[PDB]
Amino acid sequence: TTFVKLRTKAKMPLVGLGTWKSPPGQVKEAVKAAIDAGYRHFDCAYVYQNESEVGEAIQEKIKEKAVRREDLFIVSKLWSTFFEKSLMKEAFQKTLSDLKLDYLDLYLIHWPQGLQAGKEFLPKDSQGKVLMSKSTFLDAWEGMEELVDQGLVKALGVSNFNHFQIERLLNKPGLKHKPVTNQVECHPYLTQEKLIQYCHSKGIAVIAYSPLGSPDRPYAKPEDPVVLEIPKIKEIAAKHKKTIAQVLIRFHVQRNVAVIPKSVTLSRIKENIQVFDFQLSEEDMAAILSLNRNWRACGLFVTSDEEDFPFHEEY
Numbered sequence: 032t033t034f035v036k037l038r039t040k041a042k043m044p045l046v047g048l049g050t051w052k053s054p055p056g057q058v059k060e061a062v063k064a065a066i067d068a069g070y071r072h073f074d075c076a077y078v079y080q081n082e083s084e085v086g087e088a089i090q091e092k093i094k095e096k097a098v099r100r101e102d103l104f105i106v107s108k109l110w111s112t113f114f115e116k117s118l119m120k121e122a123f124q125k126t127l128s129d130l131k132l133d134y135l136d137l138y139l140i141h142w143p144q145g146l147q148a149g150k151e152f153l154p155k156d157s158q159g160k161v162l163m164s165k166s167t168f169l170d171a172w173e174g175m176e177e178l179v180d181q182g183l184v185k186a187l188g189v190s191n192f193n194h195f196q197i198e199r200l201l202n203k204p205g206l207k208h209k210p211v212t213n214q215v216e217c218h219p220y221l222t223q224e225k226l227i228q229y230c231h232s233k234g235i236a237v238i239a240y241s242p243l244g245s246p247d248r249p250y251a252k253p254e255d256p257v258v259l260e261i262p263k264i265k266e267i268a269a270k271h272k273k274t275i276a277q278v279l280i281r282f283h284v285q286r287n288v289a290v291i292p293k294s295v296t297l298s299r300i301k302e303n304i305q306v307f308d309f310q311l312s313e314e315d316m317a318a319i320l321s322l323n324r325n326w327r328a329c330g331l332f333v334t335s336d337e338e339d340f341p342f343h344e345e346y
């Protein structure tokens with residue numbers, strides 16, 4: 032299978048194109064190339080500020096008859112400065128207008144902590160301390176549910192949520208639309224076994240980002256573990272006549288976890304979806320899963336002492 036069926040029975044393609052850090056002058060071509068290589072799932076966000084260029088790409092391929100709207104799975108995300116409901120509606124309409132779409136397939140809460148509204152994405156006081164808001168992810172969810180009832184969003188999900196936080200959402204008084212995905216960092220050094228088990232058992236599909244360990248991240252350090260250099264992955268890649276990246280991506284697909292590798296490089300965009308023509312052995316999967324060290328590269332870490340930080344819990 033190339034998809035995972037969500038609680039709603041909508042089909043989410045297991046491989047999607049990631050866009051975080053794709054420059055605005057390069058992302059239009061990457062998305063065009065992806066569509067031509069058969070990608071149908073596209074992950075974008077308000078805070079990536081490249082949604083307009085993604086939307087141009089999608090519109091051009093629809094107009095060319097290369098792909099039908101109903102066969103695309105477009106995801107975007109609400110940024111934490113926009114949890115308040117009126118602000119949420121303006122942010123969403125901008126994300127929908129930029130993408131030139133009539134509806135999103137999936138709209139996610141980007142992070143679970145709310146951040147102070149204003150122009151900046153990461154508001155700070157004079158000390159350089161990040162400023163939080165009074166709006167919670169619960170508060171934001173109530174706003175987002177209206178979008179579903181309106182037909183503007185097919186389904187809602189979460190990103191960077193721990194299982195306690197999802198429980199809280201699932202137990203929210205008056206809940207109307209249950210979350211359909213949790214999108215979180217996932218690779219052999221952060222396997223997510225317990226979180227994936229919990230989501231799957233709760234009607235929620237998982238979406239794994241940073242499958243290649245995000246080597247273009249801005250704060251990479253020499254002392255960080257290097258996903259793309261794991262020695263067992265080269266071994267397994269060679270045996271399957273695949274690349275190291277293809278093994279790292281397959282690792283998710285084979286767990287029925289969707290995965291959104293980001294590239295703006297034509298050869299790599301093509302390579303990354305070439306993962307439905309081989310199968311990792313039980314020993315291969317057992318060996319990859321062995322590598323877990325609970326090591327994360329991604330997240331808003333400066334807010335670790337504020338309420339609703341996700342990464343202190345085991346999962």
Ligand SMILES: NC(=O)c1ccc[n+]([C@@H]2O[C@H](COP(=O)([O-])OP(=O)(O)OC[C@H]3O[C@@H](n4cnc5c(N)ncnc54)[C@H](OP(=O)(O)O)[C@@H]3O)[C@@H](O)[C@H]2O)c1
Binds near residue numbers: 075190191245295299
């Ligand atoms: N908080 C969240 O919810 C969250 C957080 C992080 C990411 N995301 C999403 O997940 C996506 C994936 O995460 P990521 O962007 O952090 O990292 P990633 O996808 O793991 O890695 C991207 C990097 O790997 C390179 N690359 C891609 N394909 C490759 C290949 N076959 N071989 C070698 N290198 C390759 C890219 O270079 P080129 O681009 O130059 O080719 C880029 O530098 C993001 O774009 C975004 O859509 C969401």
